[PDB]
């Protein structure tokens, strides 16, 4: 359910990792024992495991360089940090509906986190366009 263009280019800098399931899901309290949105995926995915297996084999210096390889390598490399960012973003969105008011000290750390995440996403999109131009 992850969407790209007609060639495989990233189309988002805020939530590009949201699949169809994340998009159809909203912010509500979870069921009694049903796992969260990420738990079942992590138990049943091979997404974050490709990052680990590439790390086992020297992630950044291997033969077979190309545009698609560059795009996928960058996506998989930044996926860990940006997925942590997305988890804390969905935590913030749930807090938006919690109303269980927290101290404003929690707001500034979240602001810094989302600022860094947005900068990372925008630079990743620019670097996508940059390798496309290179090829």
């Amino acid at each position: 359910g992850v969407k790209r263009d007609r060639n495989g280019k990233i189309v988002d800098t805020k939530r590009p990792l949201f699949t169809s399931f994340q998009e159809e899901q909203k912010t509500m309290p979870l069921p009694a024992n049903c796992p969260s949105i990420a738990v079942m995926d992590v138990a049943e995915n091979i997404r974050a495991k490709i990052y680990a297996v590439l790390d086992k084999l020297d992630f950044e210096n291997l033969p077979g360089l190309s545009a698609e390889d560059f795009v996928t390598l960058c996506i998989i490399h930044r996926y860990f940090d940006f997925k942590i960012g997305e988890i804390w973003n969905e935590v913030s969105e749930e807090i938006k509906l919690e109303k269980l008011r927290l101290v404003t000290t929690d707001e500034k750390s979240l602001n810094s986190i989302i600022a860094a995440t947005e900068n990372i996403g925008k630079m990743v999109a620019s670097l996508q366009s940059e390798m496309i131009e290179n090829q």
Binding site: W88, V91, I95, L102, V103, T105, D106
Partner: protein, 49 residues
């Protein structure tokens, strides 16, 4: 990680609860201390007179 820190700063709402808790401690004593001093003002006025 931050869920724990989210809950710890939820307990900082006790400080936010302490905001008015110690206002009460002072709002009815910042008036009595002013009122307590008025007890020594009118007793010597007519006494001197």
């Amino acid at each position: 990680h931050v869920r724990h820190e989210k809950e710890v700063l939820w307990q900082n709402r006790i400080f936010r609860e302490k905001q008015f808790e110690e206002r009460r401690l002072k709002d009815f004593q910042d008036a009595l201390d002013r009122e307590a001093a008025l007890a020594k003002q009118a007793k010597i006025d007519f006494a001197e007179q």
